[PDB]
Ligand binder design. Sequence first.
Ligand SMILES: [Mg+2]
Ligand SMILES: [Mg+2]
Ligand SMILES: [Mg+2]
Ligand SMILES: [Mg+2]
Ligand SMILES: [Mg+2]
Ligand SMILES: [Mg+2]
Ligand SMILES: [Mg+2]
Ligand SMILES: [Mg+2]
Ligand SMILES: [Mg+2]
Ligand SMILES: [Mg+2]
Ligand SMILES: [Mg+2]
Ligand SMILES: [Mg+2]
Ligand SMILES: [Mg+2]
Ligand SMILES: [Mg+2]
Ligand SMILES: [Mg+2]
Ligand SMILES: [Mg+2]
Ligand SMILES: [Mg+2]
Ligand SMILES: [Mg+2]
Ligand SMILES: [Mg+2]
Ligand SMILES: [Mg+2]
Ligand SMILES: [Mg+2]
Ligand SMILES: [Mg+2]
Ligand SMILES: [Mg+2]
Ligand SMILES: [Mg+2]
Ligand SMILES: [Mg+2]
Ligand SMILES: [Mg+2]
Ligand SMILES: [Mg+2]
Ligand SMILES: [Mg+2]
Ligand SMILES: [Mg+2]
Ligand SMILES: [Mg+2]
Ligand SMILES: [Mg+2]
Ligand SMILES: [Mg+2]
Ligand SMILES: [Mg+2]
Ligand SMILES: [Mg+2]
Ligand SMILES: [Mg+2]
Ligand SMILES: [Mg+2]
Ligand SMILES: [Mg+2]
Ligand SMILES: [Mg+2]
Ligand SMILES: [Mg+2]
Ligand SMILES: [Mg+2]
Ligand SMILES: [Mg+2]
Ligand SMILES: [Mg+2]
Ligand SMILES: [Zn+2]
Lengths: 53, 137, 97
Amino acid sequence: ASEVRIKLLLECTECKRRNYATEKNKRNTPNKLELRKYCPWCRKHTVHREVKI
Amino acid sequence: HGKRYRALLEKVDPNKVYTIDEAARLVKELATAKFDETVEVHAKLGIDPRRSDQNVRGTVSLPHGLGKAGRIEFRNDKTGAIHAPVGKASFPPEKLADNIRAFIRALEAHKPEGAKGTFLRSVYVTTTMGPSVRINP
Amino acid sequence: SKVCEISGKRPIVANSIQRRGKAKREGGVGKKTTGISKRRQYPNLQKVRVRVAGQEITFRVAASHIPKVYELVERAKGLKLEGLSPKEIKKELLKLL
RNA sequence: GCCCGGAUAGCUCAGGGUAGAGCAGGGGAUUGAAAAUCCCCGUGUCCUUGGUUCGAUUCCGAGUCCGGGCACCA
RNA sequence: GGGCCUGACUGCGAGGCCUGCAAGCCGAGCAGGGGCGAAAGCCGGGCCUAGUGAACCGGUGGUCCCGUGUGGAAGGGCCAU
RNA sequence: UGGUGUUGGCUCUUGGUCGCGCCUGCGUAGGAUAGGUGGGAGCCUGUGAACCCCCGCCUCCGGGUGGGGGGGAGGCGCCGG
RNA sequence: GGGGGGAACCUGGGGAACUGAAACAUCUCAGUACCCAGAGGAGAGGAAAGAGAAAUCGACUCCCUGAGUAGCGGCGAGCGA
Ligand SMILES: [Mg+2]
Ligand SMILES: [Mg+2]
Ligand SMILES: [Mg+2]
Ligand SMILES: [Mg+2]
Ligand SMILES: [Mg+2]
Ligand SMILES: [Mg+2]
Ligand SMILES: [Mg+2]
Ligand SMILES: [Mg+2]
Ligand SMILES: [Mg+2]
Ligand SMILES: [Mg+2]
Ligand SMILES: [Mg+2]
Ligand SMILES: [Mg+2]
Ligand SMILES: [Mg+2]
Ligand SMILES: [Mg+2]
Ligand SMILES: [Mg+2]
Ligand SMILES: [Mg+2]
Ligand SMILES: [Mg+2]
Ligand SMILES: [Mg+2]
Ligand SMILES: [Mg+2]
Ligand SMILES: [Mg+2]
Ligand SMILES: [Mg+2]
Ligand SMILES: [Mg+2]
Ligand SMILES: [Mg+2]
Ligand SMILES: [Mg+2]
Ligand SMILES: [Mg+2]
Ligand SMILES: [Mg+2]
Ligand SMILES: [Mg+2]
Ligand SMILES: [Mg+2]
Ligand SMILES: [Mg+2]
Ligand SMILES: [Mg+2]
Ligand SMILES: [Mg+2]
Ligand SMILES: [Mg+2]
Ligand SMILES: [Mg+2]
Ligand SMILES: [Mg+2]
Ligand SMILES: [Mg+2]
Ligand SMILES: [Mg+2]
Ligand SMILES: [Mg+2]
Ligand SMILES: [Mg+2]
Ligand SMILES: [Mg+2]
Ligand SMILES: [Mg+2]
Ligand SMILES: [Mg+2]
Ligand SMILES: [Mg+2]
Ligand SMILES: [Zn+2]
């Protein structure tokens, strides 16, 4: 990590629980990440949105 | 102020709060102008003026009201105030309190979801050319 | 500074505790005691001069028990005090406490 | 971490109706020179986006970035 | 190089490599819900081997476990970071 | 060194905040010094209009306002560009 | 009536350090040692503005147990109802 390659959580967009933590480079990727991922809570895939760690 | 108004002033007293019913009984005592005055209900929403999202706007279909049927549109001004016609000075007292109360209800129904303060910071009943009385909403 | 003549208060011993850090209540890691040490805490002693049977009597009393002195003077009304020296008047006055 | 804040032309800068000021650059006057002085001219999404108003650098939401402040660091 | 994608999964994990401890490493297979593919199948990040830091204290999002007579609350636990 | 006790009297001047009263608001079109909406065809005058004398002033220089001395029936809107 | 004495014991007012933490500062040693005041054959404490969950017990002191429990703790060393 650095100040530019930063850490982040992914929050299930349906139930709002943070389920995955990952990293990205906020220069190379100024937009908030969107990714389909498996929410254990909803037991199904679900688009997750980057949320400030 | 004119003698005519100076007169009315006596039948008021600021301190006192009054009640929807008590105010309805005064209206008539306060409508001394040569025509069927109105009444009006001035509030004072305790929300942030310069904004949006928390903007109070809408309509209400008063059961009696106007007599000039219902559905009045009201919208908070740039300040924290909101005003609306509740009927004409005529209307039997037990007919206004029904609207005053029916209008104030709509206001609460259109309170935002993000508002700080007691919302109805203050409320008053009046007439076109008469003075005014605070009220316990 | 010593003792209250009325209330009996005398200096107590206290610790002066230096701390550091942010209290847990304020979302901090907690408070660290960077030093403890003994100090003294004195009664707020003060002089009170009252006239009683035309002699000047004077008390070392804690501020808090000041009006108590004026109370003692009041209750001294029904007292055969005249002619006495300051000392034995004061003696008499305290006997009422 | 939180609180206060600045972004307006090449540089530095004041400001619900608007867009300017200082010297830097250029043209001209003047000069033995170097200046100082004097006259004219430029050099703008007024940080970004979104929302008020008939409209806005001006009010508000949100961002991006430097500036300041306070505090904490297992 | 291109197309479609988010498996840079959740719950586990037979069996091992390494090893004083603690750690480090590799892992088939089963379930859930998926991606790509006609299919066989592959996918629990990256050809590999560096890119790291035990506890303690504490922040935040969850869960609704405990709640000092009782109901709450304060404060903690658990999961995630 | 701030607060506070021991610590009191009388004055003069200030700021904050709350309640009431009153006024202050000038792009540009324009009767001309338009706060914001809302009510609304009448309202002001014997509870003294129209200009006047002193003006508390406020000023964007045109005016805005205000208590009083004169004063003895018209001013101000809807209209409508 | 006091005063002064008394081996230890006792209660009240003050109150260390080495040491332990394999350094050290919070913490430990320890309210110990020691100083001082007082008491007496003992002293202290004592008839609930108590415990604390039992719809309960019933002053205080002392022993056993509860218990190295509950807890406290640079959650370290340790401390400890
Ligand atoms: Mg991860
Ligand atoms: Mg990445
Ligand atoms: Mg779960
Ligand atoms: Mg201190
Ligand atoms: Mg501590
Ligand atoms: Mg006191
Ligand atoms: Mg912040
Ligand atoms: Mg600049
Ligand atoms: Mg590809
Ligand atoms: Mg997944
Ligand atoms: Mg194994
Ligand atoms: Mg091993
Ligand atoms: Mg298929
Ligand atoms: Mg398959
Ligand atoms: Mg596999
Ligand atoms: Mg530690
Ligand atoms: Mg923790
Ligand atoms: Mg529970
Ligand atoms: Mg419960
Ligand atoms: Mg309790
Ligand atoms: Mg409870
Ligand atoms: Mg309850
Ligand atoms: Mg909780
Ligand atoms: Mg919790
Ligand atoms: Mg001091
Ligand atoms: Mg003082
Ligand atoms: Mg003796
Ligand atoms: Mg002796
Ligand atoms: Mg002692
Ligand atoms: Mg002792
Ligand atoms: Mg010493
Ligand atoms: Mg030591
Ligand atoms: Mg030492
Ligand atoms: Mg040591
Ligand atoms: Mg050692
Ligand atoms: Mg040493
Ligand atoms: Mg100790
Ligand atoms: Mg005996
Ligand atoms: Mg006793
Ligand atoms: Mg008793
Ligand atoms: Mg200890
Ligand atoms: Mg101890
Ligand atoms: Zn979910």
